Design a protein around this ligand. Sequence first.
Ligand SMILES: Nc1ncnc2c1ncn2[C@@H]1O[C@H](CSCC[C@H](N)C(=O)O)[C@@H](O)[C@H]1O
Length: 281
Amino acid sequence: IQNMFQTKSFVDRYKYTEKLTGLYAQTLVDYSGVANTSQKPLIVLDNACGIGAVSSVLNHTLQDEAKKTWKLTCGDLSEGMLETTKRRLQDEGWVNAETKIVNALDTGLPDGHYTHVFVAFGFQSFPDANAALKECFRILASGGILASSTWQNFNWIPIMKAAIETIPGNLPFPTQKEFIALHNAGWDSESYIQSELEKLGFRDVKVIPVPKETSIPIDEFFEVCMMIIPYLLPKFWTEEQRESHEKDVPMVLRQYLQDTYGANGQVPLEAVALITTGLKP
Ligand SMILES: Nc1ncnc2c1ncn2[C@@H]1O[C@H](CSCC[C@H](N)C(=O)O)[C@@H](O)[C@H]1O
């Protein structure tokens, strides 16, 4: 049995999906205070780092003096994700950085080691977010900061649903709220997040909704859809529906996007992410 995040097909399209998660990488780094903090040296984990969105921002945002003494660990469960991150580390010239297989549910990392742990769009992807959150608390030093981003709303699932509705068969498709809660519910709620962090002993917890709007060419948006739809069909369609229609999804998506946004058009991306910070005493 495969994990979706470890398949080459998924990793290879993730650069298009990073156009969506990357909307909040600068937000998360800047809201964490890592560029202004009194903690020194910086010991940073990019947890569930993907292809390195947060790590890339950190390397472009932090002072040279701070990078002389910091250590950055880019952690992920997926060997394929880390292979891509490692190429980016080399290409962008990150300093004092390393990739490492890190299971967010059981990191193997030391108690009280990190000044900062970033979890950019990980908690709604982990099998159990609470276990991952407890690990974050364990591995942070006194005074350490957890900074996370999670989805509250976004328009791309509704766009895909509208495309799917142009197929005969009245085919099911998740709502945004269903999609974001497939693994862990609650991470679209400020009050849930605050309560969960506080129950573990985090203090000074802040949860801020941040709206973003941009646009992406239809051909790049198509790749995002193609990365996600195949993992939803076994859950939302019957076997007969898949036999009848799965092969038609690419054409339907192309046609919907061209018809709606233009043959050389741009898809509006609109989202709200919750940007959470908490302090370990
Ligand atoms: N148990 C686990 N431990 C660590 N990473 C995990 C994990 N389960 C899934 N992941 C990783 O979680 C990531 C979610 S996508 C987010 C990637 C990146 N932080 C960004 O902002 O773009 C993927 O890279 C996936 O491989």
